[PDB]
Design a protein around this nucleic acid. Structure first.
Ligand SMILES: CC/C=C/[C@@H](OC(N)=O)[C@@H](Cl)[C@H](O)CC(=O)[C@@H](O)[C@H](O)[C@H](C)/C(Cl)=C/C=C/C=C(C)/C=C/C=C/C(=O)O[C@@H]1C[C@@H](C(=O)O)CC[C@@H]1O
Ligand SMILES: CC/C=C/[C@@H](OC(N)=O)[C@@H](Cl)[C@H](O)CC(=O)[C@@H](O)[C@H](O)[C@H](C)/C(Cl)=C/C=C/C=C(C)/C=C/C=C/C(=O)O[C@@H]1C[C@@H](C(=O)O)CC[C@@H]1O
Ligand SMILES: CC/C=C/[C@@H](OC(N)=O)[C@@H](Cl)[C@H](O)CC(=O)[C@@H](O)[C@H](O)[C@H](C)/C(Cl)=C/C=C/C=C(C)/C=C/C=C/C(=O)O[C@@H]1C[C@@H](C(=O)O)CC[C@@H]1O
Ligand SMILES: Nc1nc2c(ncn2[C@@H]2O[C@H](COP(=O)(O)OP(=O)(O)NP(=O)(O)O)[C@@H](O)[C@H]2O)c(=O)[nH]1
Ligand SMILES: Nc1nc2c(ncn2[C@@H]2O[C@H](COP(=O)(O)OP(=O)(O)NP(=O)(O)O)[C@@H](O)[C@H]2O)c(=O)[nH]1
Ligand SMILES: Nc1nc2c(ncn2[C@@H]2O[C@H](COP(=O)(O)OP(=O)(O)NP(=O)(O)O)[C@@H](O)[C@H]2O)c(=O)[nH]1
Ligand SMILES: [Mg+2]
Ligand SMILES: [Mg+2]
Ligand SMILES: [Mg+2]
Lengths: 400, 400, 400
RNA sequence: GCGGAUUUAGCUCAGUUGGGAGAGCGCCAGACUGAAGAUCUGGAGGUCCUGUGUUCGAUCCACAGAAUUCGCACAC
RNA sequence: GCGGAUUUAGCUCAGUUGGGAGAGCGCCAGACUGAAGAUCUGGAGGUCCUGUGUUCGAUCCACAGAAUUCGCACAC
RNA sequence: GCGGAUUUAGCUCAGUUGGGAGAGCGCCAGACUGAAGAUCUGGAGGUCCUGUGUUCGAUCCACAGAAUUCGCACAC
């Protein structure tokens, strides 16, 4: 149901500091208007039996909403160390984010780690939201805990002292949107900190510009059997657009390029004609159950960039100084490689010249994924092995 | 069509002495009443073109009937040496039998061999029926030929002089039931010897007690494509009971456990609800032609005791003195093993202790059937190789 | 639509001398009557885009017609050296032919080669048609160019001076049948040379006698998907006859003997009951597209002479003197063998006696075709390797 | 459930009465060829389908199994 | 039925005019390791897809085949 | 998307704290047999599923992967 500017964002921060809560406080604060802005409550997201059981976001969750000017595609990341993988993924099919941060616990393990991941994953812009303020009173402490986030956002090459420290409270401002569902701006002093936070979004993040000029390509971000029909693959398409009924294909993880039909093309549960650039679309397909498509492949019309096992690439191994490894490695190294959606382990086989790649080193070499994948010379990709990120690089070529 | 006590029995004796004839003389003598007791004439049984052609029972045949008190499941065994296999089988899914014996030919090769088989196969009780009397007149000969059957039934550990020697004539008493179809007891002096014979059945054999408390299990005794539908597997179930329409399985001879439906559950050609314990039932199945089930497997609902190739067992090798072998044997010995229904050759592999099993020896060891089978620790089984029985034993364990 | 005597013939001669033209001049000259004799124009035959593009007959073409007495099955052969293969084929499912020869170019490469092929392929009778006369005027040249064809037809063991030299013009006599469609004999002096040519056919070729007393056997000469139905296999059957609806089989080239149905049995596009002996029939089949039958096999009812890879044979290797090879050869020799329809390479393996077959030599030995084929002891066959014919021989036996 | 077959060297076929099997085609050598193919002379290879019995000893006989093949029947 | 390709070492690719082909990746050695992986130095391997012709001699040329690939047509 | 398993010699199973694993069943030897089978005494074989980290050193520990298995959920 076409209309406004669909930008991509999200919340990423330590565990239990607020990512998940300050989310409804968007599907309410800016929902207190537009019939578009719907009912995205807390326990709403954390649908998972376990999630709500443990009390933490494990599984990635995304709940849209629109200010006035721009429409948004805001994703909610988990904070537990155990689940960065998921977290990572998200921050990949987005651009620019809200650094959820406890104003009562200062920075923390994930605080860093996440920003760092951001830094690593290259993310565009960030804006703090010094939250849980209400728990904090002593001012010498509220200032004192902004001087550390600037400090930190610096350390990880970032606007540091240039960034917005929208001190606020995700809960109080959400206990309001609950009482008075349609409270508007300039009404609640808590539903105000929120706006300042958006007046920083619209204010910090510039644009979600792209291009739908090159074929079907859906970085399959998700899959489910939606009762009564076939199955849908949610996932912010990079470059394509899908008018239901398009003979398609899945290019990746699965053996051969599976073909089916887009006879199902929703979007935010609100059917669209043919989703476009960066729009987190969501289509069904005729003849491809879940058993026919998993997070990872690239739903791509017959003929879009092919699947590969081998290939070549220009890589930059981060120094330990950048969270990379501290010991070089040589051929036989099998670190999983990340390609937008999924991640697959590949067996590095250094060039017939180099002998031992080292931290800091910037090099070239071959790879041989344990599975198949959508490759294209220039297709920049990331590398992480046991515990952390090691180096970034591009697909300099292809071999099979 | 439920009602009386279904006991299991049969006729076993030399070839041409009478087993097959003194059979109708039951489906008549006690048929001269109850509408249940039907038309089971001679040539009726020997349906086989060849059987009636050669003049001998080759193929196993069973024709029910009921006295007054108990109902019976009486089976007719062949006598020719060439066909003991069949004979054996029968005497397995029965209990207690009528030793058909010519009163004009004394005991004979099969006389012994069969009793012995009985003895070997462990059979409960036996009652002679010194037959063809009419051919015999001289009394010093009728007594004289009872003193040898006691003598013999002794030799093969049996009630010997305790057993019933119901001297009689299977033909004359069957030429009556032919003339006067409904002649009753105390009428024909030949149709009387018959009763004395039953008044010895009811009198000798005690009970056919059992239990239907453990799953589907049909020792598939027979198979045929019954015009217009699918196919039926006759075979006195040991422990189960089948209400038509039960999703089932065949566990044995065939590769994998074939699944189908009991949409066909006759019994004596007289449909029953759900046949039970030791009742020689007879059910059809949806999706399993003859080409899907052969004498041997165990029609057993999904989950009953599994199929095995390997396994362990406690065995008693009979001494030569007991009709067993006279030379020991060692590993590499491939004697077929008998499991209720069918019989399969297995490659004995003695324990890593014993070197040469000997007659008389009672031992333990491994086996490895040439095919698959329904095993269960405690599942007692028999062994016979070329020509005779060698030893009996139980499935002490299982291996695969 | 049964009626007259179906004899088999054709035109074979150098390239561009006339084979293709003096063809319509039959579907016209003798068509100027009988409604049977239809519209077979020049460019009609050469339907092929390329054929008419290059200006030469590459592809074999056959266009029927009937004099008065006998009906004919006349085939048009290509002349270009590049396409003898095709040419050859034709002259196989025919008998007796018209040596098309330019009266303005004397004999030529193919002139010889073709006659020779004829001679080689054993062909029965031949009649010249010294054509393009109109281009020629000087008589000392028209005689002079008949004295060379007799000369030649001699050289290649033939009636030589006994044969008909029906001097004529295929074009002029075809420019008439165009103007006056129903011009009759004794009318056009050019449409007369034609008759003389037929009055030489009927006059030279004696009979197309045969026998339909042995099973289905269609030397599959052609295949096409005929819009709306299944597919048809044209091809002068040797011995069979096919009433539509016959369960059939294809015995050759294809892996296993494919079975289908003759639910389609045309003939000259004029349905017949059940085509017969030597009649270039044409039947469809239920369940065998083109993808199920190619030029070569033998459509032969279930059970006709089997497929073979190995086999034995009595062979006569032609001397160089006969256009055969000039160097002997030994085991390992893989010359393609010709069997009526298709031709397949086979690996000769000389007998455990001979060491080196030589030109002139007449021998015996084994073969092992690269594919499967319809064999029968006595099934005479020809041999040609790179460029030419080498020797003829029969299937003395079979091996697999 | 019953009857006839046939089971042998990697392949196709032989052969026999118990002292334990032979051909071609491969196969690998040596000769010849730069090499290949062809050829010549050699060589290796078989639990003689399996068990048990009998025998001093079983490819063989007896008794029992098995695979593949042509047939006979039967709640048939 | 007709035309273009491409056929090479176990894998992926080279290479050339007739005297008979070279790389990586395997592969196996030797060094180093308790061993592995990594590495270093060696080694083996190709009937140059097949036949025939021509030649003293064919990976190569000629004539004929074959597999896989992109196209052309046709009772089409 | 989340959790429990289990991964070891050709096969079936052991075993442990970091100095690097043991049984049967095969497997091949030698004895015995003409040979077979049986038996006796020997022998060979495992990257301890994979990478990296830590360590002097990894089957083992840590961090990351993988296959197979039992469960939990979800435009579910
Ligand atoms: C899903 C597939 C997606 C792939 C792409 O993703 C995208 N974009 O989707 C990849 Cl291909 C990106 O396109 C690549 C990209 O964007 C590039 O631009 C790179 O990102 C860029 C070249 C890098 Cl790699 C920058 C790294 C900067 C690191 C810094 C400043 C480190 C922080 C140091 C502070 C600190 O104190 O850290 C502590 C201590 C430390 C120690 O002890 O030294 C250890 C670590 C600790 O945290
Ligand atoms: C279908 C599968 C069914 C299996 C079961 O079956 C069932 N039950 O269904 C089996 Cl598992 C049974 O459950 C086992 C069972 O029941 C046990 O109780 C055994 O049966 C029991 C331990 C045995 Cl084995 C007793 C044997 C007795 C033998 C005697 C008394 C021998 C006779 C001697 C006389 C004679 O002179 O014979 C001559 C001469 C002789 C020579 O020369 O010495 C040779 C032979 C001649 O005939
Ligand atoms: C499609 C399968 C069909 C197979 C059959 O097909 C059928 N029938 O369908 C085959 Cl199985 C036939 O049934 C076989 C058959 O019929 C037999 O009867 C043979 O045909 C017969 C035994 C032969 Cl082989 C005769 C050959 C005669 C050759 C001659 C007289 C040669 C001419 C010489 C003149 C000359 O100067 O030639 C020059 C010079 C020369 C040189 O230099 O020496 C070289 C060549 C030049 O042209
Ligand atoms: N005092 C105070 N408590 C808050 C505020 N925001 C959230 N909380 C409390 O913290 C709880 C859990 O925080 P939540 O938003 O789910 O954390 P998260 O970012 O999803 N972390 P993770 O998913 O990784 O466990 C809330 O339910 C609420 O009680 C706030 O602004 N002030
Ligand atoms: N005199 C006389 N003959 C009899 C008697 N019973 C049977 N017979 C004869 O013996 C014939 C065959 O006997 P039958 O019962 O078939 O023998 P069986 O027990 O089936 N033996 P098998 O089947 O092994 O051949 C009968 O048809 C009949 O003529 C009897 O009591 N007296
Ligand atoms: N002067 C003259 N020209 C003729 C005559 N017959 C044919 N032609 C010419 O030659 C042309 C081509 O001859 P055609 O019959 O197709 O030759 P073909 O026998 O099919 N040879 P190929 O098919 O092998 O090329 C005709 O179109 C026509 O112009 C004739 O009798 N006289
Ligand atoms: Mg969260
Ligand atoms: Mg009988
Ligand atoms: Mg032509």
């Amino acid at each position: 149901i076409r209309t406004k500017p669909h930008v991509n964002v999200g919340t990423i921060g330590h565990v239990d500091h607020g990512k998940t809560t300050l989310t409804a406080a968007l599907t309410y604060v800016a929902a207190a208007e537009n019939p578009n802005v719907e009912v995205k409550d807390y326990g709403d997201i954390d649908k998972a039996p376990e999630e709500r059981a443990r009390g933490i976001t494990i599984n990635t969750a995304h709940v849209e909403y629109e200010t006035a000017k721009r429409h948004y595609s805001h994703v909610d990341c988990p904070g537990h160390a155990d689940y960065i993988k998921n977290m990572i993924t998200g921050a990949a099919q987005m651009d620019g984010a809200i650094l959820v941060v406890s104003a009562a616990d200062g920075p923390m393990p994930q605080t860093r780690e996440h920003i760092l991941l951001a830094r690593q994953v290259g993310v565009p812009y960030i804006v703090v939201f010094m939250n849980k303020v209400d728990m904090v009173d002593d001012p010498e402490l509220l200032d004192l805990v902004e001087m550390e986030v600037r400090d930190l956002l610096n350390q990880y090459e970032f606007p540091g002292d240039e960034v917005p420290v929208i001190r606020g409270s995700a809960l109080l401002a959400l206990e309001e949107m609950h009482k008075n569902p349609k409270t508007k701006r300039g009404e609640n002093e808590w539903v105000d900190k929120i706006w300042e936070l958006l007046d920083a979004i619209d204010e910090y993040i510039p644009t979600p510009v792209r291009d739908v000029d090159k074929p079907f390509l859906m970085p399959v971000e998700d899959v489910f059997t939606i009762t009564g029909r076939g199955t849908v693959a949610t996932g912010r398409i990079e470059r394509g657009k899908v008018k239901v009924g398009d003979e398609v294909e899945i290019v990746g993880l699965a053996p051969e390029t599976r073909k089916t039909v887009v006879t199902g093309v929703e979007m935010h549960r609100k059917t669209l004609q043919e989703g476009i650039a960066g729009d987190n679309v969501g289509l069904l397909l005729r003849g491809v159950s879940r058993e026919e498509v998993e997070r990872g492949q690239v739903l791509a019309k017959p003929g879009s960039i092919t699947p590969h096992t081998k290939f070549e690439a220009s890589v930059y191994i981060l120094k330990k100084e950048e969270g990379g490894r501290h010991t070089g490695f040589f051929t036989g190294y099998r670190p999983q490689f990340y390609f937008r959606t999924t991640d697959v382990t590949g067996v590095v086989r250094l060039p017939q010249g180099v002998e031992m790649v080292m931290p800091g080193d910037n090099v070239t070499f071959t790879v041989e994924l344990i599975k198949p994948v959508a490759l294209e010379e220039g297709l920049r990709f990331a590398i992480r092995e046991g515990g952390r990120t090691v180096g970034a690089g591009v697909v300099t070529k292809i071999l099979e």
